[PDB]
Design an enzyme around this catalytic site. Structure first.
Site, PDB file in Angstrom:
ATOM      1  N   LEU A 203      23.973  52.524  52.839  1.00 58.53           N
ATOM      2  CA  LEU A 203      24.112  51.901  51.737  1.00 58.53           C
ATOM      3  C   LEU A 203      23.058  52.151  50.559  1.00 58.53           C
ATOM      4  CD1 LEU A 203      25.079  48.320  53.083  1.00 58.53           C
ATOM      5  CD2 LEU A 203      26.856  50.216  52.175  1.00 58.53           C
TER       6      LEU A 203
ATOM      7  N   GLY B  89      37.330  34.303  49.373  1.00 56.51           N
ATOM      8  CA  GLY B  89      38.372  33.817  48.531  1.00 56.51           C
ATOM      9  C   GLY B  89      39.679  34.623  48.856  1.00 56.51           C
TER      10      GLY B  89
ATOM     11  N   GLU C  37      22.012  54.710  49.625  1.00 57.38           N
ATOM     12  CA  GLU C  37      22.399  56.023  49.158  1.00 57.38           C
ATOM     13  C   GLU C  37      23.381  55.789  47.880  1.00 57.38           C
ATOM     14  OE1 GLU C  37      23.310  59.117  51.901  1.00 57.38           O
ATOM     15  OE2 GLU C  37      23.337  60.599  50.496  1.00 57.38           O
TER      16      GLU C  37
ATOM     17  N   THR D 121      36.160  30.470  44.119  1.00 61.32           N
ATOM     18  CA  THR D 121      35.714  30.823  45.124  1.00 61.32           C
ATOM     19  C   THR D 121      34.968  31.990  45.015  1.00 61.32           C
ATOM     20  OG1 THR D 121      36.782  29.107  46.666  1.00 61.32           O
ATOM     21  CG2 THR D 121      35.436  31.217  47.838  1.00 61.32           C
ATOM     22  N   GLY D 122      35.956  32.996  44.697  1.00 63.61           N
ATOM     23  CA  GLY D 122      35.478  34.393  44.458  1.00 63.61           C
ATOM     24  C   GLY D 122      34.239  34.462  43.447  1.00 63.61           C
TER      25      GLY D 122
ATOM     26  N   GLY E   8      38.550  33.800  40.576  1.00 68.67           N
ATOM     27  CA  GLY E   8      38.823  32.537  41.321  1.00 68.67           C
ATOM     28  C   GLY E   8      37.612  31.926  41.508  1.00 68.67           C
TER      29      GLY E   8
HETATM   30  N1  GTP Z   1      44.403  42.545  43.658  1.00 74.47           N
HETATM   31  C1  GTP Z   1      44.403  41.394  44.051  1.00 74.47           C
HETATM   32  N2  GTP Z   1      44.042  40.256  43.339  1.00 74.47           N
HETATM   33  C2  GTP Z   1      44.173  38.990  43.750  1.00 74.47           C
HETATM   34  C3  GTP Z   1      44.632  38.725  44.979  1.00 74.47           C
HETATM   35  N3  GTP Z   1      44.667  37.458  45.168  1.00 74.47           N
HETATM   36  C4  GTP Z   1      44.217  36.833  44.054  1.00 74.47           C
HETATM   37  N4  GTP Z   1      43.821  37.895  43.266  1.00 74.47           N
HETATM   38  C5  GTP Z   1      43.300  37.845  41.889  1.00 74.47           C
HETATM   39  O1  GTP Z   1      42.097  37.086  42.058  1.00 74.47           O
HETATM   40  C6  GTP Z   1      42.200  36.161  40.807  1.00 74.47           C
HETATM   41  C7  GTP Z   1      42.214  34.648  41.368  1.00 74.47           C
HETATM   42  O2  GTP Z   1      41.378  34.379  42.046  1.00 74.47           O
HETATM   43  P1  GTP Z   1      41.349  34.010  43.850  1.00 74.47           P
HETATM   44  O3  GTP Z   1      40.988  35.115  44.640  1.00 74.47           O
HETATM   45  O4  GTP Z   1      43.043  33.828  44.089  1.00 74.47           O
HETATM   46  O5  GTP Z   1      40.740  32.530  43.909  1.00 74.47           O
HETATM   47  P2  GTP Z   1      39.894  32.205  45.023  1.00 74.47           P
HETATM   48  O6  GTP Z   1      38.585  33.089  45.125  1.00 74.47           O
HETATM   49  O7  GTP Z   1      40.586  31.881  46.040  1.00 74.47           O
HETATM   50  O8  GTP Z   1      39.256  30.721  44.346  1.00 74.47           O
HETATM   51  P3  GTP Z   1      39.877  29.291  44.276  1.00 74.47           P
HETATM   52  O9  GTP Z   1      41.360  29.432  44.699  1.00 74.47           O
HETATM   53  O10 GTP Z   1      39.609  28.950  42.899  1.00 74.47           O
HETATM   54  O11 GTP Z   1      39.085  28.403  45.337  1.00 74.47           O
HETATM   55  C8  GTP Z   1      43.235  36.422  39.948  1.00 74.47           C
HETATM   56  O12 GTP Z   1      42.796  37.353  39.076  1.00 74.47           O
HETATM   57  C9  GTP Z   1      44.172  36.943  40.797  1.00 74.47           C
HETATM   58  O13 GTP Z   1      44.939  38.071  40.250  1.00 74.47           O
HETATM   59  C10 GTP Z   1      44.920  39.873  45.837  1.00 74.47           C
HETATM   60  O14 GTP Z   1      45.287  39.658  47.133  1.00 74.47           O
HETATM   61  N5  GTP Z   1      45.041  41.201  45.394  1.00 74.47           N
END
Ligand code: GTP
Ligand code: KLC
Ligand code: ACP
Ligand code: GDP
Ligand code: CA
Ligand code: CA
Ligand code: CA
Ligand code: MG
Ligand code: MG
Lengths: 437, 427, 54, 343
Positions: free
Chosen positions: A252, A10, A254, A145-146, A143
């Protein structure tokens, strides 16, 4: 030598991964084109930096890394960025349309269609490992995906690589930089499903990073770039023991042995010091005692919570720069008499200390001043459960009215998965209370 | 990625044409389809609304629909009329006589297949289609009846794509025929089921703003449409320029729609400026924020102070302090926290785009999902019921094969919608 | 307070300071869940298409 | 303007403050689960400290120090004074106490008790707990009384020689009010109270509780002629100082108040590193009620500390005003001092 594969999932995982690999290349003297003049063995070798970098016959040093995102715009910046020559195209995986901040869309709908491609690309990396340790997985909680694709990936990695350790670097959601209202839902859903598959997870609350950037770097409104360069410094101090010669946290497994006595309680609190503005014209170099004492200040933690009102299970101090054991011990002795540092009764009251003599590297032109000594403390304290309580409370507010639940059910998730996941989080909170109260 | 735009009927095509005039200017596209801008932020997401033709020509992904040729002849003759793809003009000759049944069931049914032919051709050449946006009024016959027929047909062929509308709500203050409450109630019935997001643009609010705020003694439709095209430019800013928040139709819907039927938004804009009127004064970030939340600046004739916000999206445009924008946005929520439901934490999301609209150094666009929108549907329902209890003007609709039962069901569904808003206003 | 396990190399050193002594789903099961979710999406779409056909 | 919530209704001290808050026209009360508050009148038990200080754009202040229950619970205080270096077991202003579970000190207490029987010294002890009192001269009946109940009890040295107000030959305990703000300044209210006894002190039978326990409830009900020397068994500081000048040729400041300020500053600076909200993401303050005993040598003893204290009736207006002035307005400024700063 035992290899480590990094997986970035993500937007948050990918952008932080870019920050990390830029920093790794600076720390090891690897140029953007992949060349590394100080490496005298061309096209091979099993040095400590080889845990993260493979080598081609042409002397190119290639990250053992896979980037995965369900839409292409973030990874496209990697394909055309400063370090584009570093990565093989097979390592950069993009879909067409993203998970729309919907765990169910990333996990069930889109994840089902792409999971086998991702595993095939990971297998291509694994096939070039003489002794793979496992995986470091970078992703946001919030997110689609994340949260959703990561939890599916963690499940399948347990199947395909059962004996391999899996560590997480997870971005905990903060409204000041958050993009979705449903992030508490996604965070609980992905924590419930990933919990039995992650051996150790480093949570980073964007609120703490944001406030450290405002307060210590004098950034009025921090961007993801500001946040990600600070986060990569912390990630680098955590993974330095895998990438350099040493005796603490050299593999890892550890991390679990030294930080996680109870498998479900596998979320260590990270604290980092010093964070000094590069714009400051005159810097006063903090001593070992001062940066060590800063590790017990909530304002320097990756998650705002109060360790004075929990119990410690383990504590690791990771110093970089001009540090000798004599000064660390004099610092620990002083702090013990002035701070509330209580361990659980079934654990030793002690610290594992690692020192790397190389000072922290900073990105030229970044926001962080170069310092002569820095420290990252990893501590497994029950106080991090405050972060679960905050998250579970926002979940409860929305779920009582079933707000937004139809978006998840429309992707084929059952409504029962919400309550199942929330019950698992309730038992997690109770576990922390049993250990620490 | 790609959005397909449809505009149907007289109102839909007049506001649709002005929408394309405005955003073409923002993206640097001249009336002949050539790019003449100076910023790469203009082209980075140009494909969302424009197809690329050889010769560096950008052509709107726009389909123009009507059951009579008049308004679309005016569009061809208008300022940017040469920019549209000539194959995307689909029109009949008979008209719809301000009659929802003619648009939906008789006259519109004869034309609908050839509209879907053009929709299919545009969708097929999309790398990855997000969905559709429709501009129309609810008070006439083509935009209301044929527009909602089109939405249902498009959902049937693209069931997994987002459907978004800019729907102009009729008002007795700015009315063409007495049957507007019938056409609007029949249309809302359709919109509750088949759209994901509907921007409720109330001609009553637009008139009141032109008259009271902009000091226009005799507002025309042109004056009303100036407010709409500026609002449409604002609410699509996050889709058209690089940004992190509500950057595509689905993420916006997920952030804004907690319950599938409650997807009717109140839009607003600041600063309010009239046609040809230049005010050169700088507007501070506090002034933008207070004005965009002000009841007087809303374009659905309902009072947000009478309800609670389920969700809010705000978009700031121009070069300004992002620290100040955050501070002012938090100031409004912390000082007036009762107007935001507590069971949706952090339900106000803010986006900021560097490119300001033409004529202004900074502006702010507001998108609110407020329970006070029930007042709009209550108003339509009362005007519907005053006539329907005497079966007045119904013969225009039964003559097209409709039965009275379809009116009763549409009224019942709209009254249910009203009750569902009131439920979450007290929760 | 005793220092144990002191290791040294040219890149740094590590040791431990003690202050006080003490006082999975299978591949088939994953595919089952993914296919069940897919079937639920398919059912819900079939219900929509049946509604639009009416 | 400023906002606050109310999660604890029964606080007579924070009801008057909440009323005074609204009376300024610059404060507004929110619902219970609205997180956008500047001030939380939180619940006494299970307060979700973990959810405070995470709201962007709000300075958040709660009326409690998280971790202050150490000083405010009886067994916790006995363990604090004994185990803390700044306080020591040799603490001379705190009566010898022993935590006894039904970490235990049954043998350590039997050792010092039997010592008092060998030398024939005064050997009267008292059993009490923060959950509920039994005064005895024999140890076998104090241990049996701790086991009939099922909670932690303390056995403290009962001061057999208190200072007695005349006429009446009666016992009293002093209540002081201490406000500690967000900066951990120690403010001692200039007005204290003496919760006196209505019936003459009787050292023959510890059976009749009324002459030994000076609580306002035990005197309002169990004592006849309750409030015959002073209204409500409450002697304020101007009258007690006049009695000390007449009867003992000394003042309330010299003979008693210097020791009271010493004990207040000892206990509070002790836990200060474990509860201070300096550099914490949410700030705290708390009003405390210290309970002191004065013996016949004009020596002040500490009995207990109450973190959730009530105020005397005629002092509700002045103290709650000082709560708003020093603790709340110092954090939220509105558009002589009644406190003594202990530093
Ligand atoms: N620290 C940090 N947080 C991030 C960044 N990009 C997104 N976020 C955080 O991640 C969350 C949003 O999820 P994303 O990673 O952008 O979403 P994704 O994994 O791409 O998933 P989708 O777009 O829904 O398919 C929010 O809480 C954002 O503030 C980054 O580059 N750095
Ligand atoms: C916060 C949600 C909002 C609800 C309100 C009550 C808002 C809140 C604030 O404006 C941002 C109030 C504003 O600061 C001041 C005090 C200057 C006010 O005198 C302006 C005109 C009166 C007002 O009505 C009472 C206005 O028309 C409106 O809407 O006031 C609805 O969108
Ligand atoms: N060691 C001791 N010596 C003399 N008197 C004592 C004593 N311990 C307790 N007392 C008496 O018993 C009474 C109540 O004791 P304590 O203060 O422990 O109870 P409590 O917590 O119910 C009071 P509050 O309701 O004011 O908080 C006191 O007013 C005091 O007179
Ligand atoms: N704001 C605005 N409203 C319009 C315009 N033209 C018509 N209307 C409104 O639209 C409704 C009539 O529908 P119309 O679009 O003319 O009929 P159609 O051609 O059958 O779709 C009435 O409520 C009018 O007030 C316009 O250009 N701008
Ligand atoms: Ca080599
Ligand atoms: Ca496993
Ligand atoms: Ca015909
Ligand atoms: Mg994404
Ligand atoms: Mg018309």
């Amino acid at each position: 030598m035992r290899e480590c594969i990094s997986i970035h999932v993500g937007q948050a995982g990918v952008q932080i991964g870019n920050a990390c690999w830029e920093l790794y290349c600076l720390e090891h003297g690897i140029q953007p084109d992949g060349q590394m003049p100080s490496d005298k063995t061309i096209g091979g070798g099993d040095d400590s930096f080889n845990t993260f970098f493979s080598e081609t016959g042409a002397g190119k040093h290639v990250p053992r890394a896979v980037f995965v995102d369900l839409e292409p715009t973030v990874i496209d910046e990697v394909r055309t960025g400063t370090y584009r020559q570093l990565f093989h195209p097979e390592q950069l995986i993009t879909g067409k349309e993203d998970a729309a901040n919907n765990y169910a869309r990333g996990h069930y709908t889109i994840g089902k269609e792409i999971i086998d491609l991702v595993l095939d690309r990971i297998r291509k990396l694994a096939d070039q490992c003489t002794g793979l340790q496992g995986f470091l997985v970078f992703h946001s909680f919030g997110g689609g995906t994340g949260s959703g694709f990561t939890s599916l990936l963690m499940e399948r990695l347990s199947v395909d690589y059962g004996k391999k350790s899996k560590l997480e670097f997870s971005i905990y959601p903060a409204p000041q930089v958050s993009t979705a209202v449903v992030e508490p839902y996604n965070s609980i859903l992905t924590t419930h499903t990933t919990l039995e598959h992650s051996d150790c997870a480093f949570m980073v609350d964007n609120e703490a990073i944001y406030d450290i950037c405002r307060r210590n770097l004098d950034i009025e409104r921090p961007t993801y770039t500001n946040l990600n360069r600070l986060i990569s410094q912390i990630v680098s101090s955590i993974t330095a023991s895998l990438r350099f010669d040493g005796a603490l946290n050299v593999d890892l497994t550890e991390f679990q042995t030294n930080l996680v006595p109870y498998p479900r309680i596998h979320f260590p609190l990270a604290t980092y010091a010093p964070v000094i503005s590069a714009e400051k014209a005159y810097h006063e170099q903090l001593s070992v005692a001062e940066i060590t004492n800063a590790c017990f200040e909530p304002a320097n933690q990756m998650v705002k919570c109060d360790p004075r009102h929990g119990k410690y299970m383990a504590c690791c101090l990771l110093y970089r720069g001009d540090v000798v054991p004599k000064d660390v011990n004099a610092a620990i002795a002083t702090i013990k008499t002035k701070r509330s540092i209580q361990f659980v009764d079934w654990c030793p009251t002690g610290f594992k200390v690692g020192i790397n003599y190389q000072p922290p590297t900073v990105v030229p032109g970044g926001d962080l001043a170069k310092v002569q000594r820095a420290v990252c403390m990893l501590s497994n304290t029950t106080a991090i459960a405050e972060a679960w309580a905050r998250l579970d409370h926002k979940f409860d507010l929305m779920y009582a009215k079933r707000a937004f639940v139809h978006w998840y059910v429309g992707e084929g998730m059952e409504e029962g998965e919400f309550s199942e996941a929330r019950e698992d989080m309730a038992a997690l909170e109770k576990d922390y209370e049993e250990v620490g109260v | 990625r790609e959005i397909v735009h449809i505009q149907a009927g007289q109102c839909g095509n007049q506001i649709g044409a002005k929408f394309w005039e405005v955003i073409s200017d923002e993206h640097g596209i001249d009336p002949t389809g050539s790019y003449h801008g100076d910023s790469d932020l203009q082209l980075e997401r140009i494909n969302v609304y424009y197809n690329e033709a050889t010769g560096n020509k950008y052509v709107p992904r726009a389909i123009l629909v009507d059951l009579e040729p008049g308004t679309m002849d005016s569009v061809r003759s208008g300022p940017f009329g040469q920019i549209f793809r000539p194959d995307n003009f689909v029109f009949g000759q008979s008209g719809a006589g301000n009659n929802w049944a003619k648009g939906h069931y008789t006259e519109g049914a004869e034309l609908v297949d050839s509209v879907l032919d053009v929709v299919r051709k545009e969708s097929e050449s999309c790398d990855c289609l997000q969905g559709f946006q429709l501009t129309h009024s609810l008070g006439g016959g083509t935009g209301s009846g044929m527009g909602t027929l089109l939405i249902s047909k498009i959902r049937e062929e693209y069931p997994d794509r987002i459907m978004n509308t800019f729907s102009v709500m009729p008002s007795p203050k700015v009315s063409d025929t007495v049957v507007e409450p019938y056409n609007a109630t029949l249309s809302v019935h359709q919109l509750v089921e088949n759209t994901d997001e509907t921007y409720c643009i109330d001609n009553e609010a637009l008139y009141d703003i032109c008259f009271r705020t902009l000091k226009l003694t005799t507002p025309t439709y042109g004056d009303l449409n100036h407010l709409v095209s500026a609002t449409m430019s604002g609410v699509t800013t996050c889709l058209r320029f690089p940004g992190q928040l509500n950057a595509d139709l689905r993420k916006l819907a997920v952030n804004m729609v907690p319950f599938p039927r409650l997807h009717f938004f109140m839009p607003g804009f600041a600063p309010l400026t009239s046609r040809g009127s230049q005010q050169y004064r700088a507007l501070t970030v506090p002034e933008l924020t207070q004005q965009m939340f002000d009841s007087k600046n809303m374009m659905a004739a309902c009072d947000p102070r009478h309800g609670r916000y389920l969700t809010v999206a705000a978009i700031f445009r121009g070069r300004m302090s992002m620290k100040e924008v955050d501070e002012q946005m938090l100031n409004v929520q912390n000082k007036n926290s009762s107007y935001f439901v507590e069971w949706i934490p952090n339900n106000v999301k803010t986006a900021v785009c560097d490119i300001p609209p033409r004529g202004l150094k900074m502006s702010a666009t507001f998108i609110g999902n407020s329970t006070a929108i029930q007042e709009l549907f209550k108003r339509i329902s009362e005007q519907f019921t005053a006539m329907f209890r005497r079966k007045a003007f119904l013969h225009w609709y039964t003559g097209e094969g409709m039965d009275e039962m379809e009116f009763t069901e549409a009224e019942s569904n709209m009254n249910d919608l009203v009750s569902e808003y009131q439920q979450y206003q007290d929760a | 307070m005793e220092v144990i396990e002191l290791n040294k190399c040219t890149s740094g050193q590590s040791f431990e300071v003690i202050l006080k002594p003490p006082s999975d789903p299978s591949l088939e099961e994953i595919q089952k869940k993914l296919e069940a979710a897919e079937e639920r999406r398919k059912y819900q779409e079939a219900e929509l298409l049946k509604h639009l056909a009416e | 303007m400023y906002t606050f919530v109310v999660r604890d209704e029964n606080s007579s001290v924070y009801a008057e403050v909440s009323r005074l808050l609204l009376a300024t026209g610059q404060w507004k009360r929110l619902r219970k689960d609205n997180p956008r508050f500047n001030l939380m009148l939180g619940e006494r038990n299970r307060l979700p400290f973990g959810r405070l200080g995470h709201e962007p754009g709000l300075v958040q202040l709660v009326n409690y120090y998280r971790g202050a229950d150490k000083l405010c619970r009886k067994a916790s205080l006995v363990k604090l004074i004994k185990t803390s270096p700044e306080l020591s077991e040799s603490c001379t202003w705190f009566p010898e106490s022993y935590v006894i579970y039904p970490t235990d000190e049954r043998e350590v207490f039997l050792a010092a008790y039997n010592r008092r029987r060998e030398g024939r010294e005064g050997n009267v002890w008292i059993a009490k707990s923060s959950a509920g009192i039994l005064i005895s001269s024999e140890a076998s009946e104090l241990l049996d009384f701790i086991d009939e109940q099922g909670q932690v009890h303390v056995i403290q040295k009962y001061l057999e020689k208190p200072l007695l107000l005349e006429p009446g030959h009666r016992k009293f305990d002093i209540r002081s009010w201490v406000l500690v703000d967000h900066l951990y300044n120690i403010y001692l209210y200039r007005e204290g109270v003496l919760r006196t006894s209505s019936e003459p002190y009787n050292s023959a039978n510890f059976q009749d509780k009324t002459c030994h326990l000076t609580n306002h409830c035990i005197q309002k009900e169990y004592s006849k002629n309750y409030g015959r020397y002073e209204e409500g068994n409450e002697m304020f500081f101007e009258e007690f100082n006049q009695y000390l000048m007449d009867a003992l040729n000394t003042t309330l400041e010299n003979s008693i108040l210097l020791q009271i300020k010493h004990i207040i500053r000892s206990c509070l600076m002790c836990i200060e590193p474990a509860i201070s909200t300096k550099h914490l993401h949410y700030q705290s303050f708390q009003l405390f009620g210290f309970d002191f005993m004065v013996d016949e040598e004009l020596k002040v003893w500490l009995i207990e500390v109450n973190g959730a204290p009530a105020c005397a009736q005629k002092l509700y207006a002045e103290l709650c005003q000082g709560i708003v002035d020093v603790a709340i307005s110092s954090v939220f400024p509105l558009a002589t001092s009644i406190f003594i700063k202990l530093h």
